Design a binder for this molecule. Structure first.
Ligand code: CLA
Ligand code: CLA
Ligand code: CLA
Ligand code: CLA
Ligand code: CLA
Ligand code: CLA
Ligand code: CLA
Ligand code: CLA
Ligand SMILES: CCCCCCCCCCCCCCCC(=O)OC[C@H](COP(=O)(O)OC[C@@H](O)CO)OC(=O)CCCCCCCCCCCCCCC
Ligand SMILES: CC1=C(/C=C/C(C)=C/C=CC(/C)=C/C=C/C=C(C)/C=C/C=C(C)/C=C/C2=C(C)CCCC2(C)C)C(C)(C)CCC1
Ligand code: SF4
Lengths: 219, 73, 741, 73, 157, 143
């Protein structure tokens, strides 16, 4: 089990390093964009020409590498927590036998150690673990919210905001109130940053709540 | 916690939340505190206990010293 | 003028010359596969007949032949189903014990330990438990024997061959002309009476002479091998009279207008059969006969080759009011010359019909021993819900396609379409506001309940114990339906479904149907459904209304229907086309249907499905929905976490496959994220480095590898996301229902 | 557990920042004439080999780790 | 033959349309008689009326739904809550006035639907908004205070 | 010998029933554009703001918000009805500025007498390095 998980860790590290190194080495320019250095470190793209240039700047490479870093750290922490969970309870056989397949990881670690956490508050009452259950759902919500900025792109929101602006400029009583800044949709790079921030915050909060609630409700 | 480092849960800080209900206030009282508190999880208790700190006066003195150091910086 | 059969002889030669030339249908795919993008373009435009030719006649001919091919494929699938039910099933054994033997129609070969999937369903048979409901359908039809299933399979193969021959004949030998396809009046007259009406009448006849006697004997209790054959009942009024005395009078009462005599087999009872748990077959016969007469009468309204009849154009142009200017003028020309508009209307109504079918089927089980089969019920409901949602999204997509290609301003002036396009801002703004209001007042309630429960204040929640949100309107309608028999339906002996109220209908110790009480949780989930449906409608409608132009891009129609963007200018125009609106609508539809199926599953497992022990009803989950569905934590713990133990503990058993797919789907879904959060530039540069590595060893391919286009990347991401999510829910639902049902 | 997880997540974020700033350096402070022929210019001269081998190692590790896990499942 | 939907003031190239919801005689009269659309009335008085109405209608929600709704002293707590809400929306009005009105510019004229030239609303000025904000505070606080009195009085309630 | 043609305020507008995608409040405090063309017959055309209008027989005037809308309408007229139009920019103060057919000759056609603005005499890769222009609010393309 340690062999397989260590190779998974090697995978995460190699892929994260590949993304970061590729972005750093191709930051000055590539075949698709020979003069990338003239556009700076961060820029939305280079237009839909030449087949498409979405996520071509070095900033975008770092952006894509943050996901892989979170995944690698998640694998590392999952391994450490499960091994120590079995060691603290004097049952190394659980990890020695269930870590060789993914179903053991999902059933004997995630589903098994989440009973007390999700029971912090229920239709019967609440205990000191309710804060961790609320933080668990909070992290899930932030992560899913980030999925919006990650999947939806700037175009749909610009038209929607234009429609909203028309509605405000034509609604009586509310016409007396005006906006000092023209409302516009988030920038492409700004949207990627907001989505990444939400993803990372939800990831960290969810794992922190689960980790503390699982190792605290038992010991 | 110094007297019983294995049978007492460290306290991080107090909790003053007007939204708390009676069951929440009673459920967050643990390490012999007067009211709802948060159980420490950063390990500052073990570190401070290992470096020689033993009373609350020493911790307060260290906090004041760090405050003066921050102002100096 | 004058509806007639106009056809062109031998228009296309039959040979394999074009089979060896991929991309022959497209003009842009003639320069050969210089890059890998050509391969994807070859499949992305194979069925886009509008681009392959500018002639409507050729497009119509292609559509007709494609329909024939699809019919042949469906017939092959049906033949396979019947053949498997006749050779690799336990249908004969299941007939003798339909309450304990679990239906199975698939057997796996022993190769790598997979023989464990052959579960001990019953009746000395081993195989995979099926949830398609074919056994119940066959029993309702009176199949009884396996030879009949084999005969049906052979007939289906013959029908498939006939369908394929019809497509080839209509595309290469006798191809109909454009004027033949534009006969909407004749087509509607034939599809209303000659298709629906005639089909309903034929099914009613079969039910009268085959389903009624065989099923009556089965219900009364008779060995399936002892019941007389269908022809012995269809051609012998004496035996059929022994089962139904009204038949001793023959057809005389029908022609003498004394239909009351036929009240024994043409009843209007209601409810469900207490023996089988399904609808009364006599009631279904009466229903089919009535709808057949109605459809046959309706198939005589449109004018054809005679003076009598109505004109669709005349009726449409005559419906104009003071608020719509010109009215429906121009709609006939749009629906008689654009295939995309017809496809949009048909897809929308078709998906809505599928959803209605799912509702009516779980509410009123139409087949014997179907309600007590929880696995089949849940599977059928979820499957039809997904089909309906997909069809609706497709309807929106094709509406946008028509607005982009077939729209013509010179033909739509001051009509309904023009007036709608002239105030799209108001429609979109109001829909956006209603979506925000629904989201707040629907999800914020759950969040408020979660916060109160976590704060130790259950008395401040929106539950049946604290602030109640009773659905008074739904409860009133339900009670009205319960009190309908003998009052607002004197000739009805019982309500349409036991869900409206009344006693509990249980078959074989299991609850087949029972009243479904609605409370605060039902109110919350219904508003959640309304909110999700509204958001999906907002996305699709916005794409259809702004597919041509917009304030940001005034010439969006020139860019086409499917384009990635319009550059990074104006702050960003990513996903501004109608195709992208459909791409987002797919995600929202998945979310809506997922919540709908989750609500149905939890509600039926907590307030309907269960066992009767002479002391009450023991539901599967004990009724925890009424006390936990008001919070998100309850859905995560009491539904997702509690019911997932069946799929995560299936390893080493027959349901192990469900445990494997459950994980596999989770992978595919996550895989989709790679294509949803990435861009084309990164992959193109990475491919550049890999190409350098290949060139260093003289192994670079001439078909220059290229990263998937922006649109293709989005399509792959959405396809994988929905496949993974739907498959995960499928595995979870099937494993849970097959382990506790 | 909390300390280990906290420090590992901090390390991951800091590593990502290190590579991000390295890219920023290449796009804003690197001078090819001042580093003509040294280790930087040479490592940039064969960046394709580096990226190709990183991709091969990642593909190998992923293929085999996932294959072994799926086989066991 | 009648067309109830016409372009705004006959101009078909302005982002607005005249419908029986916007150009209805009764609707237009009621909307025009509101304190917000009184170009000739002092902004302070209009603000007082608006604040009175808003403050009075803002007590109810906390009275019947506040955390202490099941206690006899709910009316007082809610009166204070409405006062706090009025003070908050008061600082909101002040911030909006300080940001919106901070400069001058030769703006375009304003005319009626018939074409009669009218001066710009005095409320859309640095001093006009300040007077309106002050009236909203007095009216808003008075409305909340009256909300508590109505609870004590009103024989039906 | 070309002079910018003056904008006539007596030009009638095309027959349109009205829409919600027209001018907003930006045209009252910022600017708007006007496109005037000449049609040989009364015919239905598609407006950039949604809907369908009818251009009269003779001079037609249409006021839009952005210049892109006017250019899109002009492109539609040129590629569908073979009609040439003129675009002007109008400010709230009352100033009209000629636009698109700047010198009477379309930009796609060389006129010999224009300004060769923004035309570097080097290649795309011959620009100065970003490190050589550091601490200067300029990009390598402006050197
Ligand atoms: C052996 C009989 C035969 C032959 C030799 C041809 C030959 C030809 N046909 Mg034709 N056709 C036939 C039968 C035949 N057809 C039948 C039975 C139908 C009714 C469905 C049609 C309907 C039809 C249409 C509408 C059109 C043609 C066209 C053509 C010409 C070029 C297209 C082509 O064949 O590309 C090669 C096609 C294939 C190699 C196979 C197509 C893909 C199949 C049908 C998919 C089947 C689904 C299958 C179950 C897989 C799906 C699930 C899977 C993922 C597991 C070509 C000369 C086209 C034409 O005239 O060009 C302008 C034209 O548009 N045919
Ligand atoms: C009573 C007359 C009649 C009947 C029964 C049908 C039946 C059908 N038509 Mg059709 N049609 C008719 C008249 C009729 N049509 C006329 C007069 C016109 C010209 C205006 C059209 C033009 C038309 C078009 C353009 C299309 C259809 C299509 C269809 C099929 C829809 C698939 C479906 O959902 O049904 C259920 C499927 C079945 C019940 C499968 C069983 C099929 C059996 C054999 C019914 C065959 C009926 C047929 C008309 C018999 C005469 C053919 C004969 C010369 C051999 C369906 C089988 C669509 C299609 O899919 O193409 C094939 C389609 O594209 N029809
Ligand atoms: C399409 C549906 C259908 C079909 C195929 C049949 C077929 C049959 N029925 Mg039946 N029936 C039906 C619907 C149908 N029924 C419905 C909806 C009802 C409810 C009102 C009944 C009620 C009923 C009764 C009470 C009885 C039958 C009986 C019969 C059998 C002899 C009757 C007959 O006229 O011979 C066959 C009919 C046809 C071939 C129809 C051909 C159409 C015309 C008449 C001929 C062609 C047109 C002509 C040239 C002009 C026969 C096999 C009798 C029987 O023997 O019991 C077993 C009997 O007593 N039926
Ligand atoms: C009667 C139903 C129907 C019909 C006849 C059409 C017909 C058409 N559609 Mg359409 N559509 C439909 C329903 C339908 N659609 C629905 C329900 C949706 C919502 C999802 C859409 C959404 C849609 C979009 C967004 C687009 C079309 C487009 C088109 C046109 C080109 C299709 C093509 O050749 O692309 C190629 C077809 C394929 C590549 C087949 C691929 C099948 C998918 C990707 C795989 C799914 C996996 C499958 C479920 C099995 C999984 C197992 C797997 C592991 C092996 C064509 C005229 C395109 C167009 O340009 O219109 C002009 C367009 O972009 N459709
Ligand atoms: C869980 C993640 C998530 C969330 C919360 C949302 C939320 C929303 N989406 Mg979205 N979406 C998501 C995922 C998510 N989406 C993903 C992954 C995709 C990719 C397919 C999309 C694609 C998408 C599209 C295409 C659209 C939306 C739209 C919307 C908005 C609908 C309006 C509404 O619901 O009213 C109310 C808002 C909510 C219920 C969200 C929760 C807010 C809570 C309940 C209020 C809490 C108050 C706060 C705590 C108090 C302040 C505290 C202080 C510290 C700040 C809404 C804000 C639509 C829109 O623009 O609106 C019309 C729209 O068209 N989404
Ligand atoms: C000693 C550490 C250090 C230092 C001094 C810098 C310094 C710098 N960085 Mg850098 N960076 C670092 C570490 C560091 N970084 C690390 C660890 C990462 C990996 C995450 C990055 C990744 C990074 C990127 C991608 C970029 C920089 C950039 C920059 C430059 C401009 C920064 C800026 O614009 O400020 C602005 C500061 C912000 C916008 C704050 C960000 C908001 C955070 C992320 C949201 C946090 C929300 C919070 C957690 C929510 C709580 C949850 C609760 C509500 C429930 C600057 C010289 C930029 C640059 O060089 O320009 C070309 C650039 O693009 N950095
Ligand atoms: C579970 C989700 C998931 C998965 C499986 C992957 C997988 C992969 N990523 Mg990715 N990534 C993801 C999420 C995911 N990512 C997300 C959310 C992001 C943020 C947007 C990224 C961002 C990202 C970047 C920036 C990069 C990668 C790269 C890679 C590849 C690394 C090479 C490797 O590991 O070899 C192993 C290969 C696999 C594990 C794929 C599985 C192989 C399949 C299962 C075998 C096929 C068998 C069967 C025939 C299936 C076909 C059936 C079908 C025909 C019906 C790899 C294929 C890097 C890369 O391209 O490497 C060169 C790269 O640069 N990823
Ligand atoms: C972070 C600081 C903070 C603090 C200190 C508070 C404090 C409070 N909140 Mg609040 N809340 C906060 C953040 C905070 N909240 C955030 C970030 C949100 C968004 C998620 C909310 C959302 C929220 C809601 C929805 C509600 C509260 C309520 C309350 C009150 C609790 C009930 C009570 O005591 O009776 C009543 C409180 C009083 C009688 C004292 C308040 C009036 C003072 C004296 C103002 C004096 C002005 C005077 C009239 C002149 C309390 C004063 C509840 C409430 O009662 O609303 C006020 C309630 O409904 N909060
Ligand atoms: C809960 C009900 C479910 C439906 C959702 C309702 C919300 C939608 C609101 C959007 C309105 C947009 C106005 C369009 C404005 C518009 O279309 O123009 C006015 C429209 C045009 O009619 P014409 O005079 O032009 O008629 C000529 C036609 O042949 C050509 O269109 O006439 C109408 O009033 C339509 C009715 C709209 C109102 C629909 C509500 C119907 C009530 C149904 C109540 C059901 C439950 C109670 C039953 C007891
Ligand atoms: C002592 C000892 C030993 C030895 C060891 C060794 C000798 C090793 C090592 C080590 C190492 C060796 C480590 C490392 C690490 C590294 C890293 C982690 C990296 C990095 C880098 C980066 C991040 C970069 C950045 C950049 C870029 C990219 C651009 C330009 C430049 C710069 C720099 C800015 C052993 C254990 C055996 C045993 C015990 C004892
Ligand atoms: S889709 Fe967005 S990121 Fe991609 S090329 Fe177009 S504008 Fe740039």
């Amino acid at each position: 089990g340690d062999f397989l998980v260590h190779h998974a860790i090697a995978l995460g590290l190699h892929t994260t390093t590949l993304i970061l190194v590729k972005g750093a080495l191709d930051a000055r320019g590539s075949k698709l964009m020979p003069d990338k250095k003239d556009f700076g470190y961060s820029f939305p793209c280079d237009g839909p020409g030449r087949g498409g240039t979405c996520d071509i700047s070095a900033w975008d490479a770092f952006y894509l590498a943050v996901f892989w870093m979170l995944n690698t750290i998640g694998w590392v922490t999952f391994y450490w927590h499960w091994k120590h969970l079995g060691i603290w309870q004097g049952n190394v056989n659980q990890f020695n036998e269930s870590s060789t397949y993914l179903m053991g990881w999902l059933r004997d670690y995630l589903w098994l150690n989440s009973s007390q956490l999700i029971n912090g508050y229920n239709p019967f009452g609440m205990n000191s673990l309710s804060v961790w259950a609320w933080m668990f759902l909070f992290g899930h919500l932030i992560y899913a919210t980030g999925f919006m900025f990650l999947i939806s792109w700037r175009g749909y929101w610009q038209e929607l905001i234009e429609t909203l602006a028309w509605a405000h400029e034509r609604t009586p009583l509310a016409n007396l109130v005006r906006w000092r800044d023209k409302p516009v949709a988030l920038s492409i790079v700004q949207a990627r940053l907001v989505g990444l921030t939400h993803f990372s915050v939800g990831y960290v909060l969810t794992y922190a709540a689960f980790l503390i609630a699982s190792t605290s409700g038992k010991f | 916690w110094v007297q019983d480092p294995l049978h007492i849960r460290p306290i991080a800080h107090a909790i003053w939340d007007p939204h708390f209900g009676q069951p929440a206030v009673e459920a967050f009282t643990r390490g012999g505190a007067s009211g709802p508190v948060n159980i420490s999880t950063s390990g500052v208790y073990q570190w401070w206990y290992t470096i020689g700190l033993r009373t609350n006066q020493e911790l307060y003195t260290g906090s004041i010293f760090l405050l003066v150091l921050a102002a100096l910086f | 003028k004058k509806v007639k059969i106009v056809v062109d002889r031998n228009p296309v030669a039959t040979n394999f010359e074009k089979w060896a030339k991929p991309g022959h249908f497209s003009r842009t795919l003639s320069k050969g596969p210089t890059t890998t993008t050509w391969i994807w373009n070859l499949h992305a435009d194979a069925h886009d007949f509008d681009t392959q030719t500018s002639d409507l006649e050729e497009i119509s001919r292609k559509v007709f032949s494609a329909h024939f091919g699809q019919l042949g494929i469906i017939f092959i699938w049906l033949s396979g189903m019947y053949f498997h039910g006749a050779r690799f099933s336990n249908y004969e054994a299941w007939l003798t014990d339909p309450t304990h033997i679990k239906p199975s129609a698939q057997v796996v070969w022993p190769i790598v330990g997979q023989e464990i999937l052959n579960a001990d369903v019953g009746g000395g048979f081993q195989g995979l438990q099926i949830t398609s409901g074919f056994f119940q359908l066959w029993r309702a039809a009176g199949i009884t024997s396996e030879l009949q299933l084999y005969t049906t399979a052979i007939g289906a193969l013959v029908m498939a061959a006939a369908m394929f021959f019809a497509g080839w004949f209509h595309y290469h030998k006798a191809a109909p002309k454009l004027e033949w396809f534009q006969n909407v009046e004749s087509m509607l007259n034939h599809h209303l009476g000659g298709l629906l009406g005639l089909g309903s009448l034929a099914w009613a006849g079969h039910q009268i002479h085959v389903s009624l006697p065989i099923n009556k004997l089965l219900d009364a209790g008779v060995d399936p091998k002892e019941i007389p054959l269908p022809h012995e009942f269809t051609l012998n009024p004496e035996l059929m009279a022994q089962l139904y005395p009204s038949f001793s009078k023959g057809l005389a009462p029908f022609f003498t207008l004394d239909w009351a005599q036929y009240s024994d087999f043409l009843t209007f009872q209601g409810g469900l059969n207490p023996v089988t748990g399904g609808l009364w077959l006599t009631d279904t016969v009466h229903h089919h006969l009535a709808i057949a007469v109605l459809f046959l009468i309706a198939g005589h309204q449109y004018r054809t080759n005679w003076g009598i009849g109505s004109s669709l154009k005349e009726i449409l142009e005559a419906h104009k009011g003071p608020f719509t200017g010109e009215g429906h003028k121009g709609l006939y020309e749009i629906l008689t010359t654009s295939w995309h508009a017809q496809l949009a209307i048909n897809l929308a109504l078709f998906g809505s019909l599928s959803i209605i079918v799912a509702h009516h089927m779980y509410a009123m089980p139409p087949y014997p021993y179907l309600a007590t089969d929880y696995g089949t019920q849940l599977s059928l409901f979820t499957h039809h819900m997904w089909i309906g949602g997909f069809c609706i999204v497709g309807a929106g997509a094709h509406a946008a396609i028509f607005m982009v290609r077939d729209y013509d301003p010179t033909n739509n002036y001051n009509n309904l379409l023009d007036r709608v396009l002239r105030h799209r801002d108001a429609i979109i703004s109001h829909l956006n506001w209603v979506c925000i209001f629904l989201g707040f007042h629907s999800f914020g309630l759950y969040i408020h309940n979660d916060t109160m429960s976590a704060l130790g204040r259950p008395q401040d929640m929106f539950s049946d114990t604290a602030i109640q949100l009773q659905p008074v309107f739904a409860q009133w309608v339900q009670n009205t339906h319960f009190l309908a028999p003998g009052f607002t339906a004197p000739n009805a002996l019982a309500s349409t479904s036991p869900s409206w109220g009344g006693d509990v209908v249980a078959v074989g110790g299991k609850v087949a149907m029972m009243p479904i009480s609605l409370g605060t949780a039902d109110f919350l989930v219904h508003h959640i459904h309304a909110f999700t449906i509204h958001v999906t409608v907002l996305i699709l409608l916005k794409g259809v209304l702004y597919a041509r132009s917009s304030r940001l891009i005034p010439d969006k129609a020139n860019l086409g229907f499917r384009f990635p963007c319009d550059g990074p200018g104006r702050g960003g125009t990513c996903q501004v086309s109608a195709w992208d609106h459909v791409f987002l609508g797919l995600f929202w539809m998945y979310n809506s249907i997922s919540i709908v199926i989750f609500h149905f599953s939890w509600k039926m497992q907590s307030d309907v499905w269960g066992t009767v022990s002479a002391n009450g009803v023991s539901h599967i989950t004990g009724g925890n929905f009424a006390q936990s569905a008001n919070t998100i934590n309850g859905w995560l713990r009491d539904f997702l976490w509690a019911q997932s133990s069946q799929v995560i503990q299936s390893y080493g058993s027959a349901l192990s496959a469900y445990g494997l797919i459950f994980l596999g789907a989770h992978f595919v879904w996550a895989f989709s994220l790679m294509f949803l959060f990435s861009g084309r530039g990164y992959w193109q540069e990475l491919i550049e480095s890999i190409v350098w590595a290949h060139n260093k060893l003289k192994v670079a391919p001439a078909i220059q590898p290229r990263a998937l286009s922006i649109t293709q990347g989005r399509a792959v991401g959405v396809a994988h996301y929905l496949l993974g999510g739907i498959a995960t829910t499928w595995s979870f639902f099937l494993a849970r229902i097959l382990a506790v049902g | 557990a909390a300390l280990y997880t906290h420090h590992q997540y901090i390390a991951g974020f800091i590593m990502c920042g290190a590579f991000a700033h390295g890219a920023i350096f290449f796009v804003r402070d690197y001078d090819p004439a001042q580093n003509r022929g040294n280790v930087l210019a040479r490592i940039l001269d064969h960046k394709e080999a580096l990226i190709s081998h990183l991709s091969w190692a990642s593909l190998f590790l992923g293929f085999h780790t996932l294959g072994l896990y799926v086989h066991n499942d | 033959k009648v067309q109830v939907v016409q372009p705004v003031n006959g101009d078909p190239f302005i982002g607005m349309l005249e419908t029986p919801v916007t150009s209805s005689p009764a609707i237009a009269w009621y909307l025009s008689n509101l304190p917000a659309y009184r170009t000739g009335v002092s902004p302070l008085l209009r603000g007082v009326e608006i604040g009175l109405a808003h403050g009075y209608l803002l007590v109810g929600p906390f009275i019947k739904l506040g955390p202490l709704r099941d206690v006899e002293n709910v009316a007082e707590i809610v009166g204070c809550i409405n006062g706090a809400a009025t003070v908050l929306i008061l600082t909101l009005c002040l911030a909006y006035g300080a940001v919106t009105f901070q400069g001058e510019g030769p703006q375009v004229g304003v005319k009626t639907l018939s074409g009669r030239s009218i001066p710009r609303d005095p409320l859309q000025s640095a001093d006009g908004w300040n007077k309106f904000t002050a009236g909203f505070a007095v009216g808003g606080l008075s409305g909340a205070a009256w909300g508590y009195l109505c609870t004590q009085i009103l024989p039906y309630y | 010998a070309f002079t910018p043609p003056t904008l006539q305020s007596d030009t009638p507008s095309p027959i349109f029933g009205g829409s919600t995608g027209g001018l907003l409040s930006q045209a009252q405090v910022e600017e708007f554009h006007v496109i005037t063309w000449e049609s040989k017959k009364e015919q239905i055309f598609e407006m950039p703001t949604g809907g369908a209008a009818i251009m009269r027989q003779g001079p037609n005037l249409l006021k839009l918000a952005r210049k892109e809308q006017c250019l899109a309408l002009l492109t539609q007229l040129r590629t569908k009805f073979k009609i040439d139009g003129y675009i002007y920019r109008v400010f709230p103060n009352g100033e009209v500025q000629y636009l698109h057919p700047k010198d009477g000759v379309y930009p796609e056609k060389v006129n010999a007498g224009r300004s060769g603005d923004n035309t570097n005499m080097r290649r795309i890769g011959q620009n100065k390095e970003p490190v050589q222009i550091k601490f200067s609010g300029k990009i390598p393309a402006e050197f």
